[PDB]
């Protein structure tokens, strides 16, 4: 079997259910990100030779700044740079940590992952996507006031396509979330399926799929961050 | 003596499967074609990216609108199956 | 059912938020300053 | 490598081997390498030609009234006029650019693109 | 349990392919960036001295 | 089992086919027309205003077909013809 | 089972197939013709008048087949052949 | 249940497949031929008469396929072979 | 139930698939070949006669598959294998 | 209550119908594309007709092959149905 | 007959349609986007880095539909809606 | 009665039909497109054939391998049917 | 009276057949289109063969990945059918 949709360490608080495994994975990713951030803050070298951590962080910042400048001037969207970079690093680390060999036997022949990519959980992707949705809608309201922005989004670039435009504002968040979830959820199944093979043959397809999943996770992080920057750019114009 | 609701909901599941199959085919291929246009324009005219992202996104909007209308109707089919007793 | 949301949502959001804050207060500003100085 | 030859109406300006030739035609930007297929194209009003040569800096030439011809062996650029990067004075091209006449404006923009400011 | 050994072997293969093909180019890019920034600083010092 | 169940299942499958075809057609046609428009604007930026006019004609035909299909789906699923 | 139930389910499925095929054909054909029209307009704006002539001929050849498909679906669903 | 019921349901589904395939083929082929014609007219305004004949041959072929399909579907639906 | 009824329904659906696929393939292939011929004639008017030979080869290749499908559908429907 | 071979042969007939549908779609469209390439090449270079037929024949072979293997396997499905107990 | 049996059979067929359509769309869309990227690079090789970004935007937009369909297929197959 | 194995065989035959139909469509279209590219390239350049066969062979292999994988799995479906009791 | 397991596995085989059909179509079409682009590039500019093989292989990865995901989910459908009783 595959036990799709199973969650471990599930608990209850304030009359609400929480998936302990996904919370743990998110906390681990956040800890890694914070550790890298503090490593950078310690090893900043304005005049000295930058360290690998500084090079990585500055590469991310440079790419995101270039994207924003191409879309909308930094002077108009300064916060979008930190938002996009944190989104990108969060998703990238979440996807990449799955490569580590945390898969074992479930005592019934069904594989169990000690660490599972949080993006495979609908709550994680929904949190990210809805936060971004609220963020750039608030930014658009701020640019075009509390009233002007709704008319602009409804009318879009051509007014007479107002209905379709409405659908767009519904499609942007959903497409932002589900996509990511899918691309990670699929992984959570592939490895599981590969686990059905005997070890002496299970090793190889697992290696191939995980090696490809590394690039898939990098691509997904890049796409999600780029589309976030892009939706911000759309929401803040005129 | 099959449960009428059982037949109805199985038919609804097959119908929604068709809805999303068609929607995904259309959306994927239309987005791919619009992207072909976009990358071609960027390669030929590097400075035209800003003036191209608008029409490309309008056409992508129409393409995605079709797909997500299909999404809404598939959700109606499976969760609020019309005609189900 | 795995597609349904949960309380985890809020928790995840909170975690993301704090990370964002850190990145906005101890990573992006110093890095942008370093690039500007360079 | 490919034999670049920048040929003006009055005199063959430049010649010699090169590894890459970047330019901008009416269809769009184009890059030419040793065995590029035979080609005939028209350079844009404010075209610029970048020539990357074996172990040398890129030769940036502003071109006015340009035509590109890629042969089985050689790449020839026929220019009504052309100017190597070193010979452009910034202020003159700046003032000529954003003018009324189209020829002078295009020539100034080509000079600017050669300079490296765009 | 057997799947555990299988995925350990898979991860060993992943680590080998990484360290053998991905590490060299990324390390070279890192060294190129470090050398470029070091050269920029050296040029700044030389220009100030000049 | 009552015949109404079979008729409703058939209607649902028919509507599924209707909207699958409609979405395929709409997506492909809109993508192709948008590709043409992007290529046109990729060369002559000022051409955008005059290009919108035929582009919207194409989009109207495509979406006209799609929405006819939608109307027939609504007829199939909500008021199923022949529903005994 | 009521035979008319089977007949109506089959008729609904067939009509759905008819409309799905017609939708795909109409949408994609209109998209391709509109792509041609858009490219032609982009290359030379003045040509619009002469371009709209063959474009309408193509649109007719496509939409006529689509509407024939629609009519045959209408036959299938409302007045089902061999309804019995 | 009447065997003729199953026969007629199968015939209706088959005819729907016939019409869907014919619709898709006719729409795509006519759209492509019209794209060729429109591009030719755009490039050469005076080539209308020269191009009509090739375009008509292409149409003729596509529409012949469509009409053969329609005839076979009519045979399927109104004169179902194997009916009993 | 009568086995012949199930067999005939299956054969009718199969033949409908035969001809639907044949229709799609023939229509699209003929459209593409006609597009090529129209473009060639527009570019090179004098080659109008010369181009038909490869065009006839292409159309023959497409119609070969189409009519093979037609014959096999006739086999499926009129003389259904496995009837019993 | 019905003959198992009856439903088995019905399924085999539907399967073979799919075999031919896919084979015909692929063959027709691929041959159309290859012929379009051949026509464009002949129009562009009149004297290349002698040399173009080689790659054209290779492509047509690669397409009609797939088609005829599909035909053979449909014949297997119908005339000698696997698992026709 | 067990209702859940027919429910799950219908759900499996539905999910098969879901992800088959998704796979077709993703394959063709990635093929087309990669074709555009490869042609652009072949024109000007050092446009490679400049072109990956729109290429990945297009790849994301295409894969969106495919992976949304994959998620809904997982819902269909693993948590079947309306499964008595 | 409706012998279970008969239903299994019918489903397997239809599944093999679908597998082969999709495989044939993919193979035919892909080979046709690759051959179109090859024919155009050879038409432009006489001697290009020698170097063009290499990428053309790569594409043909990548497409035909996908088709033959479907072939093998159809053979699995109709000869060793999974889940058959 | 039908064995529910037989219905489940018949539906599973149909679904797997659809999955393979769609995946094969997608992989074939995408690989053919990418190979057409590669052949056109090699014909136009042979010296950029190495530079072109990179985006070509990226596209082939992005296509074959979806294809093999379809393969894995189909193997799930047929060999370990979800919902099997």
JSON list of N, CA, C and O in Angstrom, two decimals, chain D residues 73-104:
[
{"chain": "D", "resi": 73, "resn": "UNK", "atom": "N", "xyz": [32.34, 30.69, -45.81]},
{"chain": "D", "resi": 73, "resn": "UNK", "atom": "CA", "xyz": [33.63, 30.89, -45.16]},
{"chain": "D", "resi": 73, "resn": "UNK", "atom": "C", "xyz": [33.73, 32.20, -44.41]},
{"chain": "D", "resi": 73, "resn": "UNK", "atom": "O", "xyz": [34.35, 32.25, -43.34]},
{"chain": "D", "resi": 74, "resn": "UNK", "atom": "N", "xyz": [33.15, 33.27, -44.95]},
{"chain": "D", "resi": 74, "resn": "UNK", "atom": "CA", "xyz": [33.41, 34.62, -44.47]},
{"chain": "D", "resi": 74, "resn": "UNK", "atom": "C", "xyz": [32.11, 35.33, -44.13]},
{"chain": "D", "resi": 74, "resn": "UNK", "atom": "O", "xyz": [31.06, 35.06, -44.72]},
{"chain": "D", "resi": 75, "resn": "UNK", "atom": "N", "xyz": [32.20, 36.25, -43.18]},
{"chain": "D", "resi": 75, "resn": "UNK", "atom": "CA", "xyz": [31.10, 37.13, -42.79]},
{"chain": "D", "resi": 75, "resn": "UNK", "atom": "C", "xyz": [31.47, 38.54, -43.20]},
{"chain": "D", "resi": 75, "resn": "UNK", "atom": "O", "xyz": [32.50, 39.06, -42.77]},
{"chain": "D", "resi": 76, "resn": "UNK", "atom": "N", "xyz": [30.64, 39.16, -44.03]},
{"chain": "D", "resi": 76, "resn": "UNK", "atom": "CA", "xyz": [30.89, 40.50, -44.54]},
{"chain": "D", "resi": 76, "resn": "UNK", "atom": "C", "xyz": [29.76, 41.43, -44.14]},
{"chain": "D", "resi": 76, "resn": "UNK", "atom": "O", "xyz": [28.59, 41.13, -44.37]},
{"chain": "D", "resi": 77, "resn": "UNK", "atom": "N", "xyz": [30.11, 42.56, -43.54]},
{"chain": "D", "resi": 77, "resn": "UNK", "atom": "CA", "xyz": [29.16, 43.59, -43.18]},
{"chain": "D", "resi": 77, "resn": "UNK", "atom": "C", "xyz": [29.41, 44.80, -44.07]},
{"chain": "D", "resi": 77, "resn": "UNK", "atom": "O", "xyz": [30.48, 45.41, -44.01]},
{"chain": "D", "resi": 78, "resn": "UNK", "atom": "N", "xyz": [28.43, 45.12, -44.91]},
{"chain": "D", "resi": 78, "resn": "UNK", "atom": "CA", "xyz": [28.48, 46.29, -45.78]},
{"chain": "D", "resi": 78, "resn": "UNK", "atom": "C", "xyz": [27.77, 47.44, -45.08]},
{"chain": "D", "resi": 78, "resn": "UNK", "atom": "O", "xyz": [26.58, 47.33, -44.77]},
{"chain": "D", "resi": 79, "resn": "UNK", "atom": "N", "xyz": [28.48, 48.53, -44.85]},
{"chain": "D", "resi": 79, "resn": "UNK", "atom": "CA", "xyz": [27.96, 49.66, -44.09]},
{"chain": "D", "resi": 79, "resn": "UNK", "atom": "C", "xyz": [28.07, 50.92, -44.94]},
{"chain": "D", "resi": 79, "resn": "UNK", "atom": "O", "xyz": [29.12, 51.17, -45.54]},
{"chain": "D", "resi": 80, "resn": "UNK", "atom": "N", "xyz": [26.99, 51.69, -44.99]},
{"chain": "D", "resi": 80, "resn": "UNK", "atom": "CA", "xyz": [27.12, 53.05, -45.51]},
{"chain": "D", "resi": 80, "resn": "UNK", "atom": "C", "xyz": [28.15, 53.82, -44.71]},
{"chain": "D", "resi": 80, "resn": "UNK", "atom": "O", "xyz": [28.97, 54.55, -45.28]},
{"chain": "D", "resi": 81, "resn": "UNK", "atom": "N", "xyz": [28.13, 53.67, -43.39]},
{"chain": "D", "resi": 81, "resn": "UNK", "atom": "CA", "xyz": [29.15, 54.26, -42.54]},
{"chain": "D", "resi": 81, "resn": "UNK", "atom": "C", "xyz": [29.32, 53.39, -41.31]},
{"chain": "D", "resi": 81, "resn": "UNK", "atom": "O", "xyz": [28.43, 52.62, -40.94]},
{"chain": "D", "resi": 82, "resn": "UNK", "atom": "N", "xyz": [30.48, 53.51, -40.66]},
{"chain": "D", "resi": 82, "resn": "UNK", "atom": "CA", "xyz": [30.74, 52.76, -39.45]},
{"chain": "D", "resi": 82, "resn": "UNK", "atom": "C", "xyz": [31.84, 53.44, -38.66]},
{"chain": "D", "resi": 82, "resn": "UNK", "atom": "O", "xyz": [32.61, 54.25, -39.20]},
{"chain": "D", "resi": 83, "resn": "UNK", "atom": "N", "xyz": [31.90, 53.11, -37.37]},
{"chain": "D", "resi": 83, "resn": "UNK", "atom": "CA", "xyz": [32.86, 53.74, -36.47]},
{"chain": "D", "resi": 83, "resn": "UNK", "atom": "C", "xyz": [33.19, 52.79, -35.34]},
{"chain": "D", "resi": 83, "resn": "UNK", "atom": "O", "xyz": [32.29, 52.26, -34.68]},
{"chain": "D", "resi": 84, "resn": "UNK", "atom": "N", "xyz": [34.49, 52.58, -35.10]},
{"chain": "D", "resi": 84, "resn": "UNK", "atom": "CA", "xyz": [34.91, 51.77, -33.97]},
{"chain": "D", "resi": 84, "resn": "UNK", "atom": "C", "xyz": [34.64, 52.52, -32.66]},
{"chain": "D", "resi": 84, "resn": "UNK", "atom": "O", "xyz": [34.55, 53.75, -32.63]},
{"chain": "D", "resi": 85, "resn": "UNK", "atom": "N", "xyz": [34.55, 51.75, -31.57]},
{"chain": "D", "resi": 85, "resn": "UNK", "atom": "CA", "xyz": [34.11, 52.32, -30.30]},
{"chain": "D", "resi": 85, "resn": "UNK", "atom": "C", "xyz": [35.00, 53.47, -29.86]},
{"chain": "D", "resi": 85, "resn": "UNK", "atom": "O", "xyz": [34.51, 54.51, -29.40]},
{"chain": "D", "resi": 86, "resn": "UNK", "atom": "N", "xyz": [36.32, 53.32, -30.00]},
{"chain": "D", "resi": 86, "resn": "UNK", "atom": "CA", "xyz": [37.24, 54.31, -29.48]},
{"chain": "D", "resi": 86, "resn": "UNK", "atom": "C", "xyz": [37.03, 55.69, -30.09]},
{"chain": "D", "resi": 86, "resn": "UNK", "atom": "O", "xyz": [37.40, 56.69, -29.47]},
{"chain": "D", "resi": 87, "resn": "UNK", "atom": "N", "xyz": [36.45, 55.77, -31.28]},
{"chain": "D", "resi": 87, "resn": "UNK", "atom": "CA", "xyz": [36.39, 57.02, -32.03]},
{"chain": "D", "resi": 87, "resn": "UNK", "atom": "C", "xyz": [35.11, 57.81, -31.78]},
{"chain": "D", "resi": 87, "resn": "UNK", "atom": "O", "xyz": [34.92, 58.86, -32.41]},
{"chain": "D", "resi": 88, "resn": "UNK", "atom": "N", "xyz": [34.22, 57.36, -30.90]},
{"chain": "D", "resi": 88, "resn": "UNK", "atom": "CA", "xyz": [32.99, 58.08, -30.60]},
{"chain": "D", "resi": 88, "resn": "UNK", "atom": "C", "xyz": [33.23, 58.98, -29.40]},
{"chain": "D", "resi": 88, "resn": "UNK", "atom": "O", "xyz": [33.78, 58.56, -28.38]},
{"chain": "D", "resi": 89, "resn": "UNK", "atom": "N", "xyz": [32.81, 60.24, -29.53]},
{"chain": "D", "resi": 89, "resn": "UNK", "atom": "CA", "xyz": [32.73, 61.16, -28.40]},
{"chain": "D", "resi": 89, "resn": "UNK", "atom": "C", "xyz": [31.31, 61.13, -27.86]},
{"chain": "D", "resi": 89, "resn": "UNK", "atom": "O", "xyz": [30.35, 61.27, -28.63]},
{"chain": "D", "resi": 90, "resn": "UNK", "atom": "N", "xyz": [31.18, 60.96, -26.55]},
{"chain": "D", "resi": 90, "resn": "UNK", "atom": "CA", "xyz": [29.86, 60.73, -25.97]},
{"chain": "D", "resi": 90, "resn": "UNK", "atom": "C", "xyz": [28.91, 61.88, -26.26]},
{"chain": "D", "resi": 90, "resn": "UNK", "atom": "O", "xyz": [27.80, 61.68, -26.77]},
{"chain": "D", "resi": 91, "resn": "UNK", "atom": "N", "xyz": [29.34, 63.11, -25.97]},
{"chain": "D", "resi": 91, "resn": "UNK", "atom": "CA", "xyz": [28.41, 64.24, -25.98]},
{"chain": "D", "resi": 91, "resn": "UNK", "atom": "C", "xyz": [27.78, 64.44, -27.36]},
{"chain": "D", "resi": 91, "resn": "UNK", "atom": "O", "xyz": [26.59, 64.76, -27.46]},
{"chain": "D", "resi": 92, "resn": "UNK", "atom": "N", "xyz": [28.57, 64.27, -28.42]},
{"chain": "D", "resi": 92, "resn": "UNK", "atom": "CA", "xyz": [28.04, 64.46, -29.76]},
{"chain": "D", "resi": 92, "resn": "UNK", "atom": "C", "xyz": [26.91, 63.48, -30.05]},
{"chain": "D", "resi": 92, "resn": "UNK", "atom": "O", "xyz": [25.84, 63.86, -30.53]},
{"chain": "D", "resi": 93, "resn": "UNK", "atom": "N", "xyz": [27.14, 62.20, -29.74]},
{"chain": "D", "resi": 93, "resn": "UNK", "atom": "CA", "xyz": [26.10, 61.20, -29.96]},
{"chain": "D", "resi": 93, "resn": "UNK", "atom": "C", "xyz": [24.89, 61.48, -29.08]},
{"chain": "D", "resi": 93, "resn": "UNK", "atom": "O", "xyz": [23.74, 61.34, -29.52]},
{"chain": "D", "resi": 94, "resn": "UNK", "atom": "N", "xyz": [25.12, 61.88, -27.83]},
{"chain": "D", "resi": 94, "resn": "UNK", "atom": "CA", "xyz": [24.02, 62.23, -26.94]},
{"chain": "D", "resi": 94, "resn": "UNK", "atom": "C", "xyz": [23.14, 63.31, -27.56]},
{"chain": "D", "resi": 94, "resn": "UNK", "atom": "O", "xyz": [21.92, 63.16, -27.64]},
{"chain": "D", "resi": 95, "resn": "UNK", "atom": "N", "xyz": [23.76, 64.40, -28.00]},
{"chain": "D", "resi": 95, "resn": "UNK", "atom": "CA", "xyz": [22.98, 65.51, -28.55]},
{"chain": "D", "resi": 95, "resn": "UNK", "atom": "C", "xyz": [22.30, 65.11, -29.85]},
{"chain": "D", "resi": 95, "resn": "UNK", "atom": "O", "xyz": [21.14, 65.48, -30.08]},
{"chain": "D", "resi": 96, "resn": "UNK", "atom": "N", "xyz": [22.99, 64.36, -30.71]},
{"chain": "D", "resi": 96, "resn": "UNK", "atom": "CA", "xyz": [22.37, 63.89, -31.93]},
{"chain": "D", "resi": 96, "resn": "UNK", "atom": "C", "xyz": [21.18, 62.98, -31.62]},
{"chain": "D", "resi": 96, "resn": "UNK", "atom": "O", "xyz": [20.12, 63.09, -32.26]},
{"chain": "D", "resi": 97, "resn": "UNK", "atom": "N", "xyz": [21.34, 62.09, -30.65]},
{"chain": "D", "resi": 97, "resn": "UNK", "atom": "CA", "xyz": [20.22, 61.26, -30.23]},
{"chain": "D", "resi": 97, "resn": "UNK", "atom": "C", "xyz": [19.10, 62.14, -29.69]},
{"chain": "D", "resi": 97, "resn": "UNK", "atom": "O", "xyz": [19.33, 63.24, -29.18]},
{"chain": "D", "resi": 98, "resn": "UNK", "atom": "N", "xyz": [17.87, 61.64, -29.80]},
{"chain": "D", "resi": 98, "resn": "UNK", "atom": "CA", "xyz": [16.68, 62.40, -29.43]},
{"chain": "D", "resi": 98, "resn": "UNK", "atom": "C", "xyz": [16.55, 63.67, -30.27]},
{"chain": "D", "resi": 98, "resn": "UNK", "atom": "O", "xyz": [16.05, 64.69, -29.80]},
{"chain": "D", "resi": 99, "resn": "UNK", "atom": "N", "xyz": [17.01, 63.60, -31.52]},
{"chain": "D", "resi": 99, "resn": "UNK", "atom": "CA", "xyz": [16.85, 64.70, -32.46]},
{"chain": "D", "resi": 99, "resn": "UNK", "atom": "C", "xyz": [15.56, 64.51, -33.25]},
{"chain": "D", "resi": 99, "resn": "UNK", "atom": "O", "xyz": [14.74, 63.64, -32.93]},
{"chain": "D", "resi": 100, "resn": "UNK", "atom": "N", "xyz": [15.37, 65.31, -34.30]},
{"chain": "D", "resi": 100, "resn": "UNK", "atom": "CA", "xyz": [14.19, 65.18, -35.15]},
{"chain": "D", "resi": 100, "resn": "UNK", "atom": "C", "xyz": [14.46, 64.28, -36.35]},
{"chain": "D", "resi": 100, "resn": "UNK", "atom": "O", "xyz": [13.69, 63.35, -36.61]},
{"chain": "D", "resi": 101, "resn": "UNK", "atom": "N", "xyz": [15.53, 64.55, -37.10]},
{"chain": "D", "resi": 101, "resn": "UNK", "atom": "CA", "xyz": [15.85, 63.75, -38.27]},
{"chain": "D", "resi": 101, "resn": "UNK", "atom": "C", "xyz": [16.13, 62.31, -37.85]},
{"chain": "D", "resi": 101, "resn": "UNK", "atom": "O", "xyz": [16.78, 62.04, -36.84]},
{"chain": "D", "resi": 102, "resn": "UNK", "atom": "N", "xyz": [15.61, 61.37, -38.65]},
{"chain": "D", "resi": 102, "resn": "UNK", "atom": "CA", "xyz": [15.72, 59.96, -38.29]},
{"chain": "D", "resi": 102, "resn": "UNK", "atom": "C", "xyz": [17.12, 59.41, -38.51]},
{"chain": "D", "resi": 102, "resn": "UNK", "atom": "O", "xyz": [17.61, 58.61, -37.71]},
{"chain": "D", "resi": 103, "resn": "UNK", "atom": "N", "xyz": [17.79, 59.83, -39.59]},
{"chain": "D", "resi": 103, "resn": "UNK", "atom": "CA", "xyz": [19.12, 59.31, -39.87]},
{"chain": "D", "resi": 103, "resn": "UNK", "atom": "C", "xyz": [20.11, 59.70, -38.77]},
{"chain": "D", "resi": 103, "resn": "UNK", "atom": "O", "xyz": [20.84, 58.84, -38.26]},
{"chain": "D", "resi": 104, "resn": "UNK", "atom": "N", "xyz": [20.13, 60.97, -38.39]},
{"chain": "D", "resi": 104, "resn": "UNK", "atom": "CA", "xyz": [21.06, 61.41, -37.35]},
{"chain": "D", "resi": 104, "resn": "UNK", "atom": "C", "xyz": [20.73, 60.76, -36.01]},
{"chain": "D", "resi": 104, "resn": "UNK", "atom": "O", "xyz": [21.64, 60.38, -35.26]}
]
